[PDB]
Amino acid sequence: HSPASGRYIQQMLDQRCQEIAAELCQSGLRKMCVPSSRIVARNAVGITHQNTLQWRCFDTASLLESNNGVNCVDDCGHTIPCPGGVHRQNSNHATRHEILSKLVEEGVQRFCSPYQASANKYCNDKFPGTIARRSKGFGNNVEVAWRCYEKASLLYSVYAECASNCGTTWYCPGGRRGTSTELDKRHYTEEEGIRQAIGSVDSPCSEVEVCLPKDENPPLCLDESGQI
Ligand SMILES: CC(=O)N[C@@H]1[C@@H](O[C@@H]2O[C@H](CO)[C@H](O)[C@H](O[C@]3(C(=O)O)C[C@H](O)[C@@H](NC(C)=O)[C@H]([C@H](O)[C@H](O)CO)O3)[C@H]2O)[C@H](O)[C@@H](CO)O[C@H]1O
Numbered sequence: 001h002s003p004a005s006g007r008y009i010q011q012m013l014d015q016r017c018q019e020i021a022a023e024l025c026q027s028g029l030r031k032m033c034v035p036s037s038r039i040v041a042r043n044a045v046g047i048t049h050q051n052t053l054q055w056r057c058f059d060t061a062s063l064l065e066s067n068n069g070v071n072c073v074d075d076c077g078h079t080i081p082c083p084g085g086v087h088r089q090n091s092n093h094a095t096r097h098e099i100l101s102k103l104v105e106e107g108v109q110r111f112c113s114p115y116q117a118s119a120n121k122y123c124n125d126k127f128p129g130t131i132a133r134r135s136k137g138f139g140n141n142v143e144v145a146w147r148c149y150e151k152a153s154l155l156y157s158v159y160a161e162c163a164s165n166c167g168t169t170w171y172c173p174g175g176r177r178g179t180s181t182e183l184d185k186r187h188y189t190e191e192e193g194i195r196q197a198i199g200s201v202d203s204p205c206s207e208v209e210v211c212l213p214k215d216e217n218p219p220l221c222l223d224e225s226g227q228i
């Protein structure tokens with residue numbers, strides 16, 4: 001068991017999209033009659049005129065290899081660029097924003113570390129739209145620090161440090177490579193402010209328990225070992 005996000009919200013959205021595609025197929029929508037391996041949930045634009053970010057069930061065969069980028073979701077409900085792009089003329093998808101949004105809300109309650117939630121809230125309050133990671137900055141692929149990252153600048157396929165549900169080291173999808181592209185500048189380093197936000201969270205365990213983090217809330221709280 002790795003100290004890493006299980007990406008449980010994304011898994012649930014993909015499974016719900018597979019069911020929705022199957023239902024549309026039964027309604028006669030031929031292009032939705034596919035195996036489950038062809039269907040994922042992505043938060044993205046759609047065809048021409050569908051210019052807002054919405055949750056949609058996409059046939060992966062209709063997605064472009066690169067980008068109109070598509071976004072996946074972390075277990076605190078934040079959308080982050082994932083591999084691929086929308087073909088604005090040829091996309092094969094079903095927009096299902098309400099049900100998929102509701103599933104994200106339900107998932108956040110289950111899976112989002114209160115420590116990470118606090119760090120994310122600090123970042124969004126100070127720099128709207130940003131989320132917290134301890135990851136790379138611009139043109140340096142070694143150094144990590146707690147920063148408020150513009151979500152568009154993160155890579156879902158790259159895991160980066162985040163806060164567990166015990167306020168301990170954890171890794172989450174949505175990270176930086178430390179490259180030197182323009183996107184690599186889109187962050188605000190906030191070591192003191194993020195650390196304070198994390199330290200302000202009340203423990204799920206008593207002062208007489210050891211917190212062992214888990215990929216779902218709550219963590220394990222074990223009775224501290226006695227002076228045996
Ligand atoms: C704002 C400024 O110039 N501050 C001076 C200090 O510089 C900042 O130091 C921090 C170290 O914590 C960062 O290296 C700085 O760079 C970034 C960052 O926060 O990582 C780089 C980002 O690309 C940039 N984000 C953008 C352009 O979108 C981000 C923001 O500009 C700032 O965070 C906004 O506050 O900065 C760097 O700006 C300097 O260390 C100090 C003494 O030398 O004096 C500060 O005034």
Ligand SMILES: [Cl-]
Pocket residue numbers: 005007074075076172173
């Ligand atoms: Cl996560």
